[PDB]
Structure 1
Amino acid sequence: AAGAGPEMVRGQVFDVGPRYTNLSYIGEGAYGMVCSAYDNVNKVRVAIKKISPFEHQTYCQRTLREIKILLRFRHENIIGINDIIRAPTIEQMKDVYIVQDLMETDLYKLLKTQHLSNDHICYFLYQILRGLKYIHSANVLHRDLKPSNLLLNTTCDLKICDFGLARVADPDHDHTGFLTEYVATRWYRAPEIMLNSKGYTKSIDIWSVGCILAEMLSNRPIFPGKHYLDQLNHILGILGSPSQEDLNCIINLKARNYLLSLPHKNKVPWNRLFPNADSKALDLLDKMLTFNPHKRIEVEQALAHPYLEQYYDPSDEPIAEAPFKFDMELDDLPKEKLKELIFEETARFQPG
């Protein structure tokens, strides 16, 4: 019965039961509108995503993936699911509403108009890596880290969101051919994605965090490629031509020979790109934005880097109780089974 800001974009009815009232529109998610609401039980305002995914297989897969992961994760720097609202039967289930802590902004919105102090950059980076340590400890890859997926509240607490493209790490099966299509956001893709990688190793996430650090330093994306291959040219325009050793790491001939066909490009020094940056921040940046993914710094090493010395505390940087081993591919399931799994995964929040 309750309604919010009609128009289009799948967001006429916003029916979150009696518990959640005084709806205020926030914006458009991917599968419906997002609103803040007053939680009449906890007596605080929360965020609620309306999800109407049952039309398309892809929407379903990403929705199930996120729900399974977020329900199993519990960490200060990862958004949780507080509640899920849906019909009591599969027959009647047409939408799903996901209730989460209210986070007033995200890093994308912040960077549009706000300069970050070095102390803010340091703190944000620490929180990103702290959350990522937990994710990776569960053998999970986020695979779409970017500023819009980093939520922030009014006290600068940071929570990672959107596990719709996540996968279980599988380095033994990471190899693929040259120019293999990829789904995750272009500007934050590691170079190897375009060369020989399916993005099934943890190093894929570290690259993205490096891009996020660079973006925090200057309020501009570091590698804003306009299309698939342009992205690699942006990366090489700054890192310079890869070394013989790094090139020899790429066994696939089409990828190798593409790189060999390019004119020699020298490295652009970080301190020229970011003249106001802390030198320790640039040392860490360099280690995150390493061309060779085998040489790229790992999350725990990054946390231990001198730039983050004010925050580093391994005992207060928790890991997951056990790795995830459930299917995150979800590609050989008919629409009927996907809907059923979403129904089952969301059952715990029902009065029953």
Structure 2
Amino acid sequence: ERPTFYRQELKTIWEVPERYQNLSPVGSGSVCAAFDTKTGLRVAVKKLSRPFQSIIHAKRTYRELRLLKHMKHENVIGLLDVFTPARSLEEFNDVYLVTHLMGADLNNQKLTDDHVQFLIYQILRGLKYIHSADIIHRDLKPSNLAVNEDCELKILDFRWYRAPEIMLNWMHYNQTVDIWSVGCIMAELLTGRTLFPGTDHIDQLKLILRLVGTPGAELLKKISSESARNYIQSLTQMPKMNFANVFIGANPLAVDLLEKMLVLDSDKRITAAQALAHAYFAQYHDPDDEPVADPYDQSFESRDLLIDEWKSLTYDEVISFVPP
């Protein structure tokens, strides 16, 4: 059946099932932290802002709901509930999404090696899943990575951490753009400092190239633009520096993994599935507890529909929702 809803203000009117109590705002969609009386869980309740204002809003609402419904993995945030106070598609105007309320993010002495292993392991386990659905995160960074008390980690809400192929204007994009971001995060966890703290995208690329080397002829054979090639080969030619000398006293397997992640050529960068099997994660690696996702149908992405059709498609997904 339909739950009983109650309304309150705090500055839109929120109308939510009565199982969610003690709503207290935590950002502006806009999000309230709440107590889920059914489960005794702390939850985030996000009320989408203007979800069907235009074709672009409606499709983004649909894309967000579809993605969250698909994600079913310990290290990836999924959907705990989705509701609307509307009793039919005609009154359907508001969408609310409920997810685990996570404490800290990774913006956060420094960490021990065992604890860096554990956190990166979790990130890679989550990424293996996401990537197996043919999803690329694209913007992994310490603030999209949430942790509870026991520092169990979940990947959230999908330029110091972005792959250089993106900051150059190359478009040979692997899912390993996310593996670059993990490499930068791991380095920051290991040393306490941002690995590539660029002021603009140019400054950033300079710092990157200083560490990894200027592109080799083999990667240069992959650049289709004359100016682009001209640009890279115009830059002062930097040798690959030694990673050990940047990561002093780091566990040497950490350094070895880093050298595999922080590779300029994306086709040569270690993948998530491969990183998990690397000796650095020995103590956590379980190849039978690193599950993959069902295939994820993003064909909708290329479709040009009407607001009312994206809306109805969204309503179909709300109705058909089943809790974990």
Task: Indicate the TM-score class for this superposition, using the shorter chain for normalisation.
Answer: 0.7 to 0.9
Once the two structures are TM-superposed, the CA of residue 58 in structure 1 deviates from its matched residue by 4.4
Residue in 2 aligned with 1:219?
A: 192
Q: 1:3 aligns with which of 9, 23, 28?
A: 9
Taking structure 1 as the reference length, what is the TM-score of the superposition? 0.81
Question: Unaligned stretches of 5+ in structure 1?
Answer: 7-11, 164-185
Residue in 2 aligned with 1:102?
A: 101
2:320 matches 1:345: no
Figure out how many residues of one structure are paired with residues of the other and give that number: 314
Q: Which residue identity does 1:45 align to in structure 2? A: R
Q: Which residue identity does 1:160 align to in structure 2? A: I
Structure-2 change in CA distance of 1:341 and 1:144 (3 Å)? farther
Q: Distance in 2 between matches of 1:71 and 1:59?
A: 18
Q: Is the 8 A contact 2:223 2:229 kept in 1?
A: yes
Q: Is the 8 A contact 1:49 1:98 kept in 2?
A: yes
| Matched position secondary structure for 1:193 | helix
Structure-2 change in CA distance of 1:58 and 1:308 (3 Å)? farther
Taking structure 2 as the reference length, what is the TM-score of the superposition? 0.88
| Moved beyond 6 Å, runs of 4+ | none
Residue in 1 aligned with 2:47?
A: 50
Residue in 2 aligned with 1:24?
A: 24
Q: Distance in 2 between matches of 1:327 and 1:349?
A: 20
Structure-2 change in CA distance of 1:22 and 1:328 (3 Å)? same
Output the aligned Cα RMSD. 2.3
Residue in 2 aligned with 1:70?
A: 68
Q: Identity over aligned residues, as a percent? A: 48
Q: Distance in 2 between matches of 1:333 and 1:217?
A: 47
Q: Distance in 2 between matches of 1:265 and 1:284?
A: 22
Residue in 2 aligned with 1:142?
A: 137
Question: Unaligned stretches of 5+ in structure 2?
Answer: 1-6
2:113 matches 1:118: yes
Q: Distance in 2 between matches of 1:231 and 1:14?
A: 43
Q: Is the 8 A contact 1:61 1:330 kept in 2?
A: no
Residue in 1 aligned with 2:299?
A: 327
Q: Which residue identity does 1:323 align to in structure 2? A: P
Structure-2 change in CA distance of 1:302 and 1:246 (3 Å)? same
Q: Distance in 1 between matches of 2:209 and 2:152?
A: 34
Structure-2 change in CA distance of 1:16 and 1:199 (3 Å)? farther
Structure-2 change in CA distance of 1:324 and 1:280 (3 Å)? same
Q: Distance in 2 between matches of 1:200 and 1:265?
A: 24
Q: Distance in 2 between matches of 1:230 and 1:331?
A: 38
Q: Is the 8 A contact 1:47 1:101 kept in 2?
A: yes
Larger Rg: 2
Q: Which residue identity does 1:35 align to in structure 2? A: C
Residue in 2 aligned with 1:259?
A: 232
2:154 matches 1:154: no
